Amino acid sequence: GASKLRAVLEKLKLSRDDISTAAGMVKGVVDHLLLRLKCDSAFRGVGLLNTGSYYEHVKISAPNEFDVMFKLEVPRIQLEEYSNTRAYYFVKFKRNPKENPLSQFLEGEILSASKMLSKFRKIIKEEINDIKDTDVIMKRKRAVTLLISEKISVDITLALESKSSWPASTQEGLRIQNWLSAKVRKQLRLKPFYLVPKHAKEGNGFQEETWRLSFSHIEKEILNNHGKSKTCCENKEEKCCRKDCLKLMKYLLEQLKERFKDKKHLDKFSSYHVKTAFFHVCTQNPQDSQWDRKDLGLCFDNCVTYFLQCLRTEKLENYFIPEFNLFSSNLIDKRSKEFLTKQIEYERNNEFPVFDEF
Ligand SMILES: O=C(N[C@H]1CCCC[C@H]1C(=O)O)c1cnn2c(O)cc(-c3ccccc3)nc12
Ligand SMILES: [Zn+2]
């Protein structure tokens, strides 16, 4: 039975125009910040990445919330893996010429995430007061969050771009060979990779000089060209339910996270856990016949089921970094995974009551 699922998808599709209205305000403010950021010597090669739920056509439930990525090309870099994490790294430089534009942010031979982000926040803070066209406020440190016309929030991330070969930790990741082909995997790995400033906490405290790997652009490519067949979702006979299953999984977590926001258990779960689990199910079911539109109910049930297995077994590997486990006991406590398991199972057993705005 896919009736309630198909109902939700139609309701979610009605948010397209509202998201579009808000997006216009954001494109205006962002184009302005990039024009002013490009003036500084350090952030000269800064640009808009254009990755995320929005550009992957999976943006469900929040027109007053946008996430934007700012890429900055860094030329000849050397990476040093932090504490055998496989996902966190220190950014070092190797050549002599020319005079590196980021020299000002070096805290030794290592590029400071804090000094980099401070200048980024400083230029952004300086340019939001100069702009009079719309009312823009910058929200406090908790990378940079704006509030346009007192409604739209914009989360702005800075990401370093490296056209180098992907780190060794990714060597056995992106298992798309039997689904999207090895030909495609070769083409995709030749593309750049990004590093977003994210500190790593070992329990005692922060490492505020590390950068985490990002493949937002590859996730978009894979989601927007997702079939084994090149004509998947181009004709009546070749329509699939891949994206619809991801939209439903994303919405399932958001609704349950909303329902229990005052409880604090589900705070550690994110749409990235859902998306990662989704890509794993795509690897398990490589055929477009396994994703038939008529089988939506059965396909979403495998996604729910796989996600629950990950919660029980405390095992959800990053799709690009196999050795990094997103459901490690050190990241998410067992009681929290058990609460989310309890809730998802109840929902599945009662024809998803949370789909009806709880
Ligand atoms: O939200 C995200 N992730 C959350 C889920 C658990 C771990 C960090 C959490 C957080 O940063 O809040 C997230 C959104 N894109 N993206 C991405 O492109 C890569 C990674 C990633 C994560 C771990 C290891 C290697 C790469 N994460 C993300
Ligand atoms: Zn398709």
3-state helix/strand/coil string of 135-171: CEEEECCCCEEEEECCCEEEEEEEEEEECCCCCHHHC
Number of structural domains (the chain) is: 2
Ligand 1 touching residue 318 (CB < 6 A)? yes
Q: What are 227's strand-pairing partners?
A: none
Same domain, 83 and 1: no
Is 69 in the same domain as 183? no
Local structure of 69: helix, strand or coil: strand
Please tell me the number of the ligand nearest to residue 320's CA. Answer: 1
Q: Give the span between the Cα atoms of 82 and 33, in whole angstroms.
A: 32
End-to-end Cα spacing for the chain: 21
Q: What share of the chain is helix, strand, coil (3-state, %, to 5)?
A: 45, 15, 40
CA distance 149 to 147: 7
Which ligand does the CA of 326 lie closest to?
A: 1
Instruction: Encode burial over 83-109: b for 16+ CB neighbours within 10 A, e otherwise.
Output: eebbbbbbbebeeeeeebbbeebbeee
CA-wise closest residue to 222 among 251, 252, 242: 242
| Co-location of 227 and 203 in the same domain | no
- Per the CB < 8 A criterion, the answer to whether 156 and 70 are in contact is yes
The two three-digit tokens of residue 262, written as one number: 């005052």
**Based on the domain organization, do 99 and 134 belong to the same domain?**
yes
**CATH code of 288's domain:** 1.10.1410.40
Tokens of 155: 């989360």
CB crowding 7-44: b at 16 or more within 10 Å, else e: ebbeebeeeeeebeebeebbeebbebbbebbeeeebbe
Assess whether the C-beta atom of 213 lies below 6 angstroms from ligand 1: yes
For residues 279 and 48, what is the distance between their CA atoms, to the nearest angstrom?
25
Q: Which of 97, 104, 98, 151 is nearest to 123 (CA)?
A: 104
Token pair for 283: 């690897």
Ligand 1 centroid vs 89 CA: distance in angstroms? 14
Q: Are 207 and 274 contained in the same domain? A: no
68 assigned binding-site residue: no
In degrees to the nearest 10, what's the CA dihedral of 28, 29, 30, 35? 90
The answer to whether 240 is a known ligand-binding residue is yes
Give 252: exposed, middle or buried? Use CB within 10 Å, 0-12, 13-18, 19+: buried
- The experimental method, as deposited, was X-ray
In this structure, are 124 and 172 located in the same domain? no
Q: Are residues 185 and 72 in the same domain?
A: no
Residues spanned by the domain of 127: 15-165+193-214
154 in the same domain as 58: yes
Ligand 1 in reach of 87 Cβ (< 6 A) = yes
Indicate whether 85 and 57 sit together in one domain: yes
Answer yes or no: is the C-beta of 129 below 6 A from any ligand 1 atom.
no
Contacts for 353 with CB less than 8 Å, ≥ 6 apart: 347
Whether 82 and 170 share a structural domain: no
Measured from the Cα of 324, ligand 1's closest atom is 24
**What protein residues have CB closer than 5 angstroms to ion ligand 2?**
227, 232-233, 240
Query: What resolution (Å)?
Result: 3.2
Residues 151 and 229 in one domain: no
- Cβ proximity of 269 and 257 under 8 Å: yes
Contacts from 229-238 at CB under 8 Å and sequence distance 24+? 229/288, 232/288, 238/288
Any idea what the CATH number is for the domain that residue 65 is in? Answer: 3.30.460.90
Pocket test for ligand 1, best of 67, 191, 272, 279 (most atoms within 8 A of CB): 272
**Are 174 and 276 spatial neighbours (Cβ–Cβ below 8 Å)?**
no
**Strand duo 211-214 + 46-48: pairing:** unpaired
Q: Are strands 193-197 and 152-162 parallel, antiparallel or unpaired?
A: antiparallel
Q: Are residues 134 and 229 part of one domain?
A: no
